[PDB]
């Protein structure tokens, strides 16, 4: 059940078995053979930096070369000591992977899932053993030169990082002849590029599952989960079900609304993350991908039945060896003839296992760790951690070490409560910005790219339902014992591989010009300066922008109570008054006039963020009830959906009794359409709408955090100034009182989270759904009319007044099919709404 993980030092000498020098043509940064270590069967670790760029450099480039957060260090992984640390790092993470059954099953799949000895171009009767998609050259330095002695046929190679150490998508990038086999069943050996000590971060600001005692926190990812995600790319690549990067979500950027200048998100990324976000890809797309892979598996089955010859021509003895290997890998049956065959039950089982079970969110629940809730959650500055140190991180518990204070109720992934997690400065982390500016074409403002919501381009999703189509008569839609072995094989004389490499592209900041002082201005007004001296709260956004010593507040009552100070009273009488005013204000809720589909609203969002230029005019509550839910999505165009694909039939098709089959198909296909259209609506919602509403959660949490940071700054000011009898004696009471603000902020966020979640769900029901039903009604009307005429056209033929029977088929168009969540296809969506409503 468990594949053994071997220990190594970088020192250990080459032994023509599991420590070798390997030639990796794909690595443009390093062109010699490099030392590799087989930590378990067919899985090799290569402690070297990697790049696929022409003219690779490890240096910080002059402008950004991607839409991802970046960090550059040419020294990283240069010395033999650093390589030793990296090597042992990945051995340790692999032991951790074996600490649950899901990770044991993953590793087993990789080891026995070796890439097929051939692709589409290989003759059907042939195994080709000569291709770089299966082979890596083994080389020894003899007589002043490198020399190929052998090959290996690995499953995964694990490199250190790209120039951008924070990179997390380079393992998807397949060059040359590796792409196609990865999508056509055959599969390709996989090459990961990884830096496990560098950990990406996330928060629980928008989750109702955050700690009531500690409040909202920023956590780091467990490195084992990060590495398992990467190895899930290897899995899809090896089993030949990789989804090509042509299938992807793209960002919409526009004038007049704010969205993130974000990366593309491949369908592979959505699959390997898992959970609800997989529904951004409608079932019609997912079904095609499954059916495609099925086709290729059947095709690999037929190949194994007809194989006579080999390349090279010598290797004819090895046919049975590889017939076994691949027969086991794809899990074929034998029919009574003796031939290999795809069992459909077994294929669907394998396929769903590789695509649903093996995903990030499943992994993180199994290892009992904190993790990103949804795909488009906010990223923060990362951290660094020496994961070899058993005081910081262990095989059994990860960061949750009991004897250091960490446990289920006090996670070791928490970045502020774990002082072994070393934070990276924004100085060292390069990212894109959106510059925001007043009036034409006060100062301009910078907004970091990660603090903007991702909104997908709608054309990015799926266009199937919008295509006119013709319906016809034929239209529809036990284990093996882990055994470590010598992996050397005899050299096939491979032709050398020279790959072009990728061109580098540079990327600019975006400048956006805006008519008023919007949310981003209102948030900047709330900030403290680095080196605070003597602050006061102000009710005037322009003033706070003006002077470093004035910070904006959206609570007038708070301003007077803060600025007073301690006027010959006891310190805590003032402090408690301030905190009780803050607390009591941020817990306010107002019930609204009119019949809105949202119960209560949170009134201070208006003056906090100036939504709709609503501050000064002071009318957030009415404006929201007037405009309804879409009021919160500033500038975002009214939801629209184009005309659906019409259904039509053949002109003739007079001959045959399956003139009638066409009609049953059109009716069933009309049902499929209502379904596919709802699914398309949920994708828009998840990739375009929920992200913009959640952006208000994050913006509200920032402003509550600025108000709190200002209250604390003024408390510290006033405590140094204070000289009363009790000063020394109330010290802990003051510290504790300041710390209490995190819990108070957190409880306000329960209300804001719930309000935002309601707004979001009602946008789906009020602003999107009616437009979709409209269009399905035009599609109904049209398809019925076309069915009437098909009958009337084929009047003389087929029917002996079976014509009259076909009228009642058009009484099936009386009913609409309104959107219904208590329905097996909407289960995942139902689950997610239930839980944040509780």
Swiss-Prot record:
Q: Which residues form a coiled coil?
A: none
* GO biological process terms held by the UniProt record: proteolysis
The record's GO molecular-function terms, alphabetically, read: ganglioside GT1b binding; metalloendopeptidase activity; protein transmembrane transporter activity; toxin activity; zinc ion binding
Catalytic positions are 230
Reaction catalysed? Limited hydrolysis of proteins of the neuroexocytosis apparatus, synaptobrevins, SNAP25 or syntaxin. No detected action on small molecule substrates
What keywords would UniProt list here? Disulfide bond, Hydrolase, Lipid-binding, Metal-binding, Metalloprotease, Neurotoxin, Protease, Secreted, Toxin, Virulence, Zinc
Which parts of the chain span the membrane according to its record? Answer: none
User: Could you tell me how this protein is used in biotechnology?
Assistant: Cargo proteins fused to the N-terminus of whole toxin are imported into neurons; stabilized cargo proteins are poorer substrates, suggesting partial unfolding of the cargo protein is necessary for import. Can be used for targeted secretion inhibition in eukaryotic cells. A construct with a mammalian growth hormone-releasing factor ligand domain (GHRH) inserted between the LC and TD, when injected into rats, leads to decreased growth hormone production. The GHRH ligand domain binds to the GHRH receptor on somatotrophs where it is taken up into endosomes. There the TD inserts into the membrane, releasing LC which cleaves synaptobrevin and inhibits growth hormone exocytosis.
The EC number(s) given in the record are 3.4.24.69
Q: State the superkingdom.
A: Viruses
Name the needed cofactors. Answer: Zn(2+)
- State the residue spans of region: Belt: 452-524
Would you tell me the Gene Ontology cellular component terms?
extracellular region
- What segment(s) does the record annotate as region Translocation domain (TD)? 444-838
User: Where, by residue number, does Zn(2+) bind?
Assistant: 229, 233, 269
From the record, give the cysteines joined by S-S bonds: 437-444
Per UniProt, the cofactor note for this protein states: Binds 1 zinc ion per subunit.
Q: What class of enzyme is it?
A: hydrolase
The UniProt family comment states:
Belongs to the peptidase M27 family.
More about this protein = There are seven antigenically distinct forms of botulinum neurotoxin: Types A, B, C, D, E, F, and G; new subtypes are quite frequent. Types C and D can undergo domain swapping to create hybrid types.
Known partners and oligomeric status: Heterodimer; disulfide-linked heterodimer of a light chain (LC) and a heavy chain (HC). The LC has the proteolytic/pharmacological activity. The N- and C-termini of the HC mediate channel formation and eukaryotic host cell binding, respectively. Can also be purified in complex with a non-toxic component that is larger than the HC. Dichain toxin from strain CB-16 phage d-16 phi copurifies with NTHNA, and in complexes that include NTNHA, HA-55, HA-33, HA-22 and HA-17.
Name used for this protein in its record: Botulinum neurotoxin type D
